[PDB]
Protein: Spike glycoprotein
Amino acid sequence: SQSIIAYTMSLGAENSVAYSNNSIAIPTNFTISVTTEILP
Amino acid sequence: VTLDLICAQKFNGLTVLPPLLTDEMIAQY
Structure:
């Protein structure tokens, strides 16, 4: 039951950044990532 | 910047395709 559909382009998830004068975020963990890039 | 000859162009076979991302979506980015 699949068919072609039209929709508005999604601009990404909406997130409100928490902001306060006394508030800060210090990373408690890290991850080593490997990105693949190609050029002719 | 300003984004009639246009009307005359379409009579000779000249076409202008619309952009994928609108001006509002550009403002969102």
Q: What stands out?
A: The two ends of chain B are 21 Å apart (CA to CA). Chain B touches chain A at residues 20-21, 25, 28-29 (CB under 8 Å).
